[PDB]
């Protein structure tokens, strides 16, 4: 966007996968 | 038999890159609906000549009318045309209950309004460029209609086929006592397969389809039964957690050795 | 069964479940709590927010008020915390917005590349997420300090509400009214 003053941040998550959660 | 692996994102890329350097990976099954805004040439660069197949996780097509799916079918079909997957495939899954989104894909009620579900199968598959394969669910709870009888109707009344997940069917046998035997009539008309590891639920109440461990001996012995019963064109050795290259490579080795 | 499904979306009923059914419903519910806890370490500043029973109360409140439990779950969780507590640190708000933007890039199945999210508490901050655009590149969760949407958020967003926009890319600020 036009205030190109931006910070990229980490998020500890994960994409959709076929593997169920345990 | 082409032996491949699944690719759903970037977390596993270091591990896949290691697999590419130490093993023969004959094809890669993309979870294609995770790449819908991805530059296709960047995908081809990564594959470096290896063929691919498509697996669709979150169309959620049983929750939608045909018209809601048009936009997704358009993107997927462009990716089908550019990447020429060996097969395309989706799931029979439940993603909502009473309008609330579920945190996991749950098993469908096969016997409830079976004809409306067959109609959604026809509608979705008719919008995709190719024969849609549907994957069997790793049942946790029993119900009135067998998953086998459900898929028999899919294969008889629609243009769809079966993507047979060997460990999912093993999980259902353990969890709900669905004899693996019942799949062998359908298996004989299937050439594309999945196999993976799993984990025990707390207090060993059921097996969870985690794709996070190595394939256990009873599942490999089930694999050999499948190999005796039909033609295995392709099998994807799945992994979604614990991206240890040695464990994934051990699975790939064991799958190849078991059918030799 | 529909009783197992009911307890997944409406967990605080006392209707009995067998051990297997209870461990399954708890397992499914645990997955959405893990997503929140893994991605928002600031929640450890308030250990009461982190119990599984607190999560169950949160999901039950989401059922009674039909709050979204998809990629907007993290936003729903902030609204629950506001509904229950007199104050919540801005770092929890920020991490939950970051989580929602991340989860958007995994859940939205369109050609649109970008979500932008704002909240009334931070009128001079624009949060966003960009889907991966290249095979080996991660999805991008970003933050902008800007007054560009501050007039729109004080005049057109009631206090306590989030507002979000889906955009084809991240070249332009949203022009329109978004959702919520
Ligand atoms: Fe699958
Ligand atoms: Fe599978
Ligand atoms: Fe599986």
TrEMBL record, chain B:
Binding-site list for Fe(3+) 2: 135, 165, 194, 238
Binding-site positions, Fe(3+) 1: 55, 91, 135
Gene3D superfamilies per the UniProt record, alphabetical: Divalent-metal-dependent TIM barrel enzymes
Residues reported in the UniProt entry to bind Fe(3+) 3: 165, 168, 209, 211, 238
Keyword vocabulary terms for this entry: Metal-binding
Origin: domain of life: Bacteria
Xref: InterPro entries: MbnB/TglH/ChrH, Xyl_isomerase-like_sf
GO molecular function, one term: metal ion binding
PANTHER family: UPF0276 PROTEIN HI_1600 (PTHR42194:SF1)
UniProt protein name: DUF692 domain-containing protein
Source species: Vibrio caribbeanicus ATCC BAA-2122
Automatic annotation (TrEMBL), chain C:
Name the record gives this protein: Uncharacterized protein
